[PDB]
Nucleic acid binder design. Structure first.
Ligand SMILES: [Mg+2]
Ligand SMILES: [Mg+2]
Ligand SMILES: [Mg+2]
Ligand SMILES: [Mg+2]
Ligand SMILES: [Mg+2]
Ligand SMILES: [Mg+2]
Lengths: 185, 441, 262, 58, 131, 70
RNA sequence: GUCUCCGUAGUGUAGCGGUUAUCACGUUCGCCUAACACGCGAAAGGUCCUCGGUUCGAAACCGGGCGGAAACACCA
RNA sequence: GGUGACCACGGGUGACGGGGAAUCAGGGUUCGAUUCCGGAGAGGGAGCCUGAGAAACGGCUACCACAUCCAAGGAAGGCAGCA
RNA sequence: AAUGAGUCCACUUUAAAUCCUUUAACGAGGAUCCAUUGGAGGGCAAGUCUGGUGCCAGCAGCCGCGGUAAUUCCAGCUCCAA
């Protein structure tokens, strides 16, 4: 029959119990500090960290010198140090259990442009990314949750077509200019 | 291309109304001799042999056993010049509501009176139905018509001058009183049961030399029914006006589903846009359209077609509902309307709260007169006085009413075919008039 | 079913064909031929997915019908002809020859060969029977049968069939210490030397093989193709010399290659 | 039936109909989260009350 | 036109279909997708051929403008190009016509011809009446 | 009385004045009343509640978002 | 579309071409209790489904239409 | 003679079997009509021609239940294929 | 100042279209270009606010609320969760 794939998975898990002040306040603090839209995209990074920690714990339960443990451990540590949440000298499976979701949230493009100073606030950073003003290397990215690797960290810059790098000012600027020249000769 | 015209046959009970049109359809080639002989042999058992030509139009077994027409029915044929379809009327006191539907979905009419002694006098009288039929034809908007007198072969002498002359002058002065012009309308003698004077001038009677019709479009002369109906006025087609389509009926055809059937008033309907039914307020994409079991690419005005619709049941939309294009202005339920009326006859005075049944196109809904605004002169719409308290026959007035049951009406100033209406009670047309202002819900 | 199947679903195709999931619903379904469809490489995917000479089945059909594809020295116009193991694919208009050999990961690799080496071909004898008038026969791992062989040739040995004649020029006995190649199962594509053969009557014999690096494995007897006299192969081996190396020493090779190329 | 269905919708019938006051639109999404984070995480109040709830009816 | 450039890659030649095929990308920093005709003549100038044998298709533009990538095809001769190249691309260049009836009508005619056996005149007049 | 299998049940009408939207011979949709075939609250022996009447939702009728099909 | 029957306070129905009423009730009000329970007495409750015709006058005599309850047909 | 408390035999299944899916400490508990493999069926049964392969039903024959046309003498059916 | 959601030329895609990505030109100050669904006694985050009703209407998965000063019904306002 059809040649589709329908291979998909959820990226988040809802908390077991709702309406608890400690979890609600912690999640709201994270949302406010990182400029997130809702609770789904913090449950998503919590789920990602949960999966990573589950894999690390299972690998730790494997015996030392086991080649599967060694291979997958170096793979996971390499990915973690590529995304930059782990220091290059902390190449141990034990330190993976010590990670927190704030480390992953700090690596978002929305947070990275704010840290680099391309935006005046985290919400300004999110809207600036969404309106196609930020580019990585040469590709323009409009995804706030774009996780930035160490090699792509240096290459974050304003887009050329945006009215912050190259020319071509915005439609409101052009309309104001033409109204001004139509009012004054 | 070729122009399509709707024709409706009106007459009296047992007046040959179906018999002579069975002759007509057989001679023009709608049925064959084998079918007509099968009808003859089926009539042979229970003895109704005089209506073997009538059973072509009398499709119903109940109609066949009762010897009368209960509800209207449709047939098709091609003439020598253009394409026409024909509707029969019951011509009965009980089935006035059935026949007015057919007369409303019409472009022209043919009126039949029996020339024999003892039937013509009852046919044209206070109790006679010829007056009512000729009234309702003009009321619903039959602009031009013809008259063919049937069954002069039973007269004494058969096929005679003076009987024909007296009856045509009587009906001529009646139609002059009602508005129709005897010069414009053609007068034909036809012998139905014998089958004379439809295609060729029958040599049994030589005293009739043919009729002459003079009209604002042109002149014509006729010797037979085909010669009469091949020179009828082609009615105008308000294609530019948005789509309106009252529904004559709704069928459930096995294999395709629900098929509404009605005559298209305005606009063009083709498969490929969504339509909306006004009284029930349901929206539906049309799937296909079809006239007389023949597929069409368009439905021009004046076309009595059945169109297939999707994902609806037969109970959602019923008889009398009007459909229209949703992309254009969609027809929709009207709370009330203002009507100017000419009261014809009523034994008592007409007061507020009077609730007769208003018959508009296919809908037949009882409406209660909410109030009376003013009385109107017979002609020129002249003001007489304001705030009437009672009404009598032979009077025109402005009246506001609300139908008891949900109904969609259209003002005559906007939709001419849907502006016309009649009022029925006690088996006479009590009031006739048109609609001026309509509110929308 | 009421008869033989003549369709092959894309996801039910053999894994070594390296077909994807989104191109379509069906697989080539190779026609009947010298090799089973499980371990054959049809010409459509050989010329469309391996060499990219054609982009579609219609294009590879045009290529085949112009009579340029030569298999085992013979022109084959079948779009889904089952090539199989170590059959020489010859294209004379562009002047290259391919030997169809499994790689280290058990997949048919694009192996290019010289014409003078392509002139011959190794076969594994599958049965030896004497027929009428007392004539010995020999049926190889292909569907190819030949008459009047050397009486020293026994079952599951290797013979040197030169193309354009179909005759035998030399042969390798199945003996301990000879270079082999695994033609099925997990150890598919591994080049090694016959070290031991344990035989189980009424069942499958198991042969134990050690490669050059010293990695010793084992496989059933039906999965072994002798390819060399002792240790020199009689054919040209692909890249990696059929030495299965683990992911641990594959990853650092990839890293070294990336470092060299960057 | 004992005949007590005549009182259906009684209180909803007798309730006086007061219209909703027209008010400014509320921010939605990230702006709403920002607003409600600012209200309850960055503020200093010098007034007692033992941490009264967000809907105090003072 | 001032800033439009073609760059080729994965270039290869085959004599099996007598052509050279490659995948190319054209760089429009601030303009729309470059028209296939423009790629055709620019690539013809690139490879010293004429813009009648050039065959290009499958141009997808990367997100945010700039680069767009398609698959280029050049033949040695126009007769070979007519011989082995899809009919829809030939019709795109105007070298092939598809002036034929609908698939539905073709099936209707095929099924109507099955009711008439043998008789050539009634087998060719089957579709004449029900148009 | 259910259309299938003709069984007769009793269904609660769950709002302030939604009984007025219910008349005789209506085709109502009924769902469970909360706890899997067990009576809920102070209503004895009632395990179902009306969700829709005449193919219009009781919630819609209660909120006035759409009207009875006259 | 046709036919058959029914339609009076909210249910259960007397009713006369010259009067629509009572009853088990249903509701309200006094009637005792903090709340009841039981219990005593009055009031309202009708275009007689609607609209009309006959008549000096009709709910009922008749003509329609409406709603419900029964059947018969209705295939562009 | 053969099979049975190591559950035969009989009955039920809202049972096509499996690869698999949901849930997720570990152990498990439910779901798998459903695109891959295997099986079965073409309204219910039954019997056959042809052919390498069918007890085929977009093949035939007969009965049963439905059901199409008819000039009433006959003739033609099988959407659990796509719509 | 910046942008889309929409109008919409062209390119592209494609068997031919469509959609996406490009790209002209319009396109935001109640930016009225309007975010909803369920709740505010407890479980369980959120009001001992105000007006009606008065063991009635109703709410209430469970405890329970309502018999004239209802934190629980019908509403307004304000808050809560997604
Ligand atoms: Mg079953
Ligand atoms: Mg299954
Ligand atoms: Mg299957
Ligand atoms: Mg079968
Ligand atoms: Mg069979
Ligand atoms: Mg409240």
């Amino acid at each position: 029959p059809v040649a589709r794939s329908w291979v998909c998975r959820k990226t988040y898990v809802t908390p077991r119990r709702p309406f608890e002040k400690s979890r609600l306040d912690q999640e709201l603090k994270l949302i406010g500090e990182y400029g997130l839209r809702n609770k789904r995209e913090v449950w998503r990074v919590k789920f990602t960290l949960a999966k990573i920690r589950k894999a690390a714990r299972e690998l730790l339960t494997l015996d030392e010198k086991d080649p599967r443990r060694l291979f997958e451990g170096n793979a996971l540590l390499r990915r973690l140090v590529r995304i930059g949440v782990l220091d290059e000298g902390k190449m141990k499976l034990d330190y993976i259990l010590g990670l927190k979701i704030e480390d992953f949230l700090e690596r978002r493009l929305q947070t990275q442009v704010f840290k680099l100073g391309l935006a005046k606030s985290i919400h300004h950073a999110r809207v600036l990314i969404r309106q196609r003003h930020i580019r990585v290397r040469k590709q323009v990215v409009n995804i706030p949750s774009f996780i930035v690797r160490l090699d792509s960290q240096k290459h974050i810059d304003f887009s050329l077509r945006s009215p912050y790098g190259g020319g071509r000012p915005g439609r409101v600027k052009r309309k104001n200019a033409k109204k001004g020249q139509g009012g004054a000769g | 291309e070729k122009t399509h015209i709707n024709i409706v046959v009106i007459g009296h009970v047992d007046s040959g109304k179906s018999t002579t049109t069975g002759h007509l359809i057989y001679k023009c080639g709608g049925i064959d001799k084998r079918t007509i002989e099968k009808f003859e042999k089926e009539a042979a058992e229970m003895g109704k042999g005089s209506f073997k030509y009538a059973w072509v139009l009398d499709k119903l077994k109940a109609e066949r056993e009762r010897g009368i027409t209960i509800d209207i029915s449709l047939w098709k044929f091609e003439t020598s010049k253009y394409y026409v379809t024909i509707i029969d009327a019951p011509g009965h006191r009980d089935f006035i509501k059935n026949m007015i539907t057919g007369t409303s979905q019409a472009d022209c009419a043919v009126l039949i009176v029996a020339a024999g002694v003892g039937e013509f006098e009852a046919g044209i009288s206070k109790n006679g139905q010829t007056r009512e039929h000729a009234l309702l034809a003009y009321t619903l908007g039959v602009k031009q018509l013809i008259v063919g007198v049937n069954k002069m072969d039973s007269t004494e002498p058969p096929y005679s001058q003076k009987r024909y002359e007296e009856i045509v002058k009587e009906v001529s002065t009646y139609i002059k009183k009602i508005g129709y012009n005897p010069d414009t309308v053609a007068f034909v003698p036809i012998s139905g049961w014998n089958g004379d004077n439809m295609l060729e001038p029958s040599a049994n009677m030589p005293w009739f030399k043919g009729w002459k019709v003079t009209r604002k479009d042109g002149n014509a002369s006729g010797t037979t029914l085909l010669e009469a109906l091949d020179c009828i006025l082609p009615p105008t087609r308000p294609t530019d006006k948005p789509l309106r389509l009252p529904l004559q009926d709704v069928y459930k055809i096995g294999g395709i589903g629900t098929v509404p059937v009605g005559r298209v008033e305005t606009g063009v309907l083709k498969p490929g846009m969504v339509v909306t039914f006004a009284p029930v307020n349901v929206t539906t994409e049309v799937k296909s359209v079809e006239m007389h079991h023949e597929a069409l690419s368009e439905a021009l005005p004046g076309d009595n077609v059945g169109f297939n619709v999707k994902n609806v049941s037969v109970k959602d939309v019923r008889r009398g509902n009007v459909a229209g294009d949703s992309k254009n202005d969609p027809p929709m339920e009207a709370a009330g309307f203002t009507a100017q009326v000419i009261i014809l006859n009523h034994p008592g005075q007409i007061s507020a709260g009077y609730a007769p049944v208003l018959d508009c196109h296919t809908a037949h809904i009882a409406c209660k007169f909410a109030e009376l605004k003013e009385k109107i002169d017979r002609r020129s719409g002249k003001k007489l006085e304001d705030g009437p308290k009672f009404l009598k026959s032979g009077d025109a007035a402005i009246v506001d009413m609300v139908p008891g049951k949900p109904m969609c009406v259209e003002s005559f100033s906007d939709y001419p075919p849907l502006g016309r209406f009649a009022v029925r009670d006690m088996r006479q047309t009590v009031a006739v008039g048109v609609i001026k202002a309509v509110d929308k819900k | 079913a009421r008869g033989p199947k003549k369709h092959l679903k894309r996801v039910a195709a053999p894994k070594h064909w390296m077909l994807d999931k989104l191109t379509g619903v069906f697989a080539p379904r190779p026609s009947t031929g010298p090799h089973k469809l499980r371990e054959c490489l049809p010409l459509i995917i050989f010329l469309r997915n391996r060499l990219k000479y054609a982009l579609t089945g219609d294009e590879v059909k045009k290529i085949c019908m112009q009579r340029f594809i030569k298999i085992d020295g013979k022109v084959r116009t079948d779009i889904t002809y089952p090539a199989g193991f170590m059959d020489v694919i010859s294209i004379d208009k562009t002047g290259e020859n391919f030997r169809l050999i499994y790689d280290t990961k058990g997949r048919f690799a694009v192996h290019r060969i010289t014409p003078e080496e392509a002139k011959y071909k190794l076969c594994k004898v599958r049965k030896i029977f004497v027929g009428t008038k007392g004539i010995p026969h020999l049926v190889t791992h292909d569907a190819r049968t030949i008459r009047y062989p050397d009486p020293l040739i026994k079952v599951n040995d290797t013979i040197q069939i030169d193309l354009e004649t179909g005759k035998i020029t030399d042969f390798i006995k199945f003996d301990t210490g000879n270079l082999c190649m695994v033609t099925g199962g997990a150890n598919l594509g591994r080049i090694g030397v016959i070290t031991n053969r344990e035989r189980h009557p009424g069942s499958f014999d198991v042969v134990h093989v050690k490669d050059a690096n010293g990695n010793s494995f084992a496989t059933r007897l039906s999965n072994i193709f002798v390819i060399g006299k002792g240790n020199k192969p009689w054919i040209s081996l692909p890249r990696g010399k059929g030495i299965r190396l683990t992911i641990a020493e594959e990853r650092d090779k990839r890293l070294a290659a990336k470092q060299s190329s960057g | 039936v004992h005949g007590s269905l005549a009182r259906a919708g009684k209180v909803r019938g007798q309730t006086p109909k007061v219209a909703k006051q027209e008010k400014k639109k509320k921010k939605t999404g990230r702006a709403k989260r920002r607003m409600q984070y600012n209200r309850r995480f960055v503020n200093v109040v010098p007034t007692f009350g033992k941490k009264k709830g967000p809907n105090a009816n003072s | 036109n001032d800033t439009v450039t073609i760059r080729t890659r994965k270039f290869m030649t085959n004599r099996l279909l007598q052509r050279k095929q490659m995948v190319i990308d054209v760089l429009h920093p601030g303009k729309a997708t470059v028209p296939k005709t423009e790629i055709r003549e620019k690539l013809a100038k690139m490879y010293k051929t004429t813009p009648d044998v050039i065959f290009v298709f499958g141009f997808r533009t990367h997100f945010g403008g700039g680069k767009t990538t398609g698959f280029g095809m050049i033949y040695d001769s126009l007769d070979y190009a007519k011989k082995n190249e899809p009919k829809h691309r030939l019709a795109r260049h105007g070298l092939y016509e598809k002036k034929k009836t609908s698939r539905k009508q073709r099936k209707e005619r095929k099924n109507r011809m099955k009711k008439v056996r043998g008789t050539a005149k009634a087998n060719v007049g089957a579709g004449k009446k029900p148009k | 009385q259910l259309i299938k299998n003709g069984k007769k049940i009793t269904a609660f009408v769950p709002n302030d004045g939604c009984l007025n939207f219910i008349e005789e011979n209506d085709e109502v949709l009924v769902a469970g009343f909360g706890r899997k075939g067990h009576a809920v609250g102070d209503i004895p022996g009632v395990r179902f509640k009306v969700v829709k009447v005449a193919n219009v939702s009781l919630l819609a009728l209660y909120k006035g978002k759409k009207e009875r099909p006259r």
